[PDB]
Nucleic acid binder design. Sequence first.
DNA 1: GCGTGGGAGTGTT
DNA 2: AACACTCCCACGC
Length: 118
Amino acid sequence: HMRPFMCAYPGCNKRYFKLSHLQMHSRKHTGEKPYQCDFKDCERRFSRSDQLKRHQRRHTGVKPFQCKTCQRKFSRSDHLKTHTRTHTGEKPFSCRWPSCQKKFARSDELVRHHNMHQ
DNA sequence: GCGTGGGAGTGTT
DNA sequence: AACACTCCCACGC
Ligand SMILES: [Zn+2]
Ligand SMILES: [Zn+2]
Ligand SMILES: [Zn+2]
Ligand SMILES: [Zn+2]
């Protein structure tokens, strides 16, 4: 005998003989943070799937993004982008305090500068 | 200054 | 939905 009922979630193929058991299962997808890491002793939950798959690069230590200049590898592409700013010397973020023409290569660098102005 | 995590907005298929 | 880019914010050295 096979079960009549099923979860309509795209990926949950759990089937139940009883409707009561499917009802309890249906509330598992009503997800505070559905995506959870299943690496040993991490169990960290995330809101999106791509955020979890980015986090799991910590357990594997993979660095798929490499700098074309200094050959250094990085775990994420955005961190590679600002690393290239270290080589090219560009500083888009400029301080907007009077009589202070100071530029930085990262937004959080300018924020730290704006706070030290006070 | 700069590596390197999480959150979130957006785009392409 | 999967996948990716890209930004801010934050922690750390
Ligand atoms: Zn389900
Ligand atoms: Zn994990
Ligand atoms: Zn480099
Ligand atoms: Zn300034």
